[PDB]
Amino acid sequence: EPLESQYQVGPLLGSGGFGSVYSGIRVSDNLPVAIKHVEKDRISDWGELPNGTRVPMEVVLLKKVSSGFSGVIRLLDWFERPDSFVLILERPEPVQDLFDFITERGALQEELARSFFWQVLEAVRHCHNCGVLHRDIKDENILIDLNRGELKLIDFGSGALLKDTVYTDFDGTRVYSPPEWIRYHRYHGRSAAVWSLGILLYDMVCGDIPFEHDEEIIRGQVFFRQRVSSECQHLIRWCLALRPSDRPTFEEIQNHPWMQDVLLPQETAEIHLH
Numbered sequence: 001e002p003l004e005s006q007y008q009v010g011p012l013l014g015s016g017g018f019g020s021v022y023s024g025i026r027v028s029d030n031l032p033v034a035i036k037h038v039e040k041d042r043i044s045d046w047g048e049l050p051n052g053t054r055v056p057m058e059v060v061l062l063k064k065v066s067s068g069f070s071g072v073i074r075l076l077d078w079f080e081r082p083d084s085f086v087l088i089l090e091r092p093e094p095v096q097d098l099f100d101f102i103t104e105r106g107a108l109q110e111e112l113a114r115s116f117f118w119q120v121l122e123a124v125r126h127c128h129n130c131g132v133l134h135r136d137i138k139d140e141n142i143l144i145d146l147n148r149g150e151l152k153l154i155d156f157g158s159g160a161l162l163k164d165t166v167y168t169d170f171d172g173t174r175v176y177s178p179p180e181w182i183r184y185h186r187y188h189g190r191s192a193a194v195w196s197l198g199i200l201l202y203d204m205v206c207g208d209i210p211f212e213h214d215e216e217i218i219r220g221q222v223f224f225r226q227r228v229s230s231e232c233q234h235l236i237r238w239c240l241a242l243r244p245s246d247r248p249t250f251e252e253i254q255n256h257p258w259m260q261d262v263l264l265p266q267e268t269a270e271i272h273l274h
């Protein structure tokens with residue numbers, strides 16, 4: 001029943017605005033886990049559990065996206081402490097986040113970026129199907145299960161329940177945020193997610209994000225610093241349309257000619273990760 005007996009705490013993996021994440025092991029079966037701590041006073045968004053229990057939004061959202069689908073990090077357990085919440089999450093091993101992967105490899109070959117981008121799209125569609133909006137899709141929030149070539153979305157701490165009305169709050173990453181958020185402090189869920197996906201795909205094929213300042217985001221002029229195919233540039237420019245309604249739907253992205261003939265995750269690990 002207690003936290004200390006159920007899990008063996010390992011080293012600190014990282015910390016930041018999201019809280020503190022440790023490597024861990026579930027004592028019973030030696031299953032690798034990640035133990036995330038978040039202070040109650042530092043919590044950006046609070047959520048309501050069906051039984052009335054007040055919990056961080058991440059607990060609500062991760063419970064909604066809980067199935068056999070490997071594209072989203074699994075919430076294994078959670079605990080309330082007097083001044084904090086502790087979340088026990090899945091930990092693939094060996095693992096590397098996409099930001100570190102891109103830093104080490106530079107710009108990704110298009111075949112690899114296609115496989116990775118396709119899995120991110122499948123994971124985001126699963127969230128939206130479950131009524132969950134991530135709101136912080138970026139290289140740092142994507143983990144690569146290096147042996148299986150499977151990607152997982154992490155950090156639902158800036159997320160929200162998906163709705164069809166305007167969002168006026170935002171606590172994700174500014175450089176992945178759309179021009180309507182920068183200009184008006186307003187955005188709709190799906191079209192803002194598609195913009196962050198265009199930032200992510202550019203990041204994968206160029207090895208860096210396209211915009212650093214508010215003025216560049218608002219202007220939305222995309223410059224390619226690396227050699228990128230015409231079909232890939234077209235998809236990126238489409239996701240990054242200034243008008244939210246001009247951005248593609250997830251169906252239009254996955255039917256795009258650049259997205260055809262994706263590798264399977266295991267083929268991806270064999271060709272590119274081994």
Ligand SMILES: Cc1cc(-c2ccncc2NC(=O)c2nc(-c3ccccc3F)ccc2N)cc(N)n1
Nearest residue numbers: 013014018021034073089090091095097140154155
């Ligand atoms: C260590 C860190 C934390 C976050 C993270 C942020 C917010 N909320 C949760 C986070 N992490 C997780 O949930 C989480 N992290 C890892 C992990 C991440 C990077 C390197 C090695 C790892 F084992 C594995 C399983 C997880 N379930 C993000 C990044 N890039 N790095």
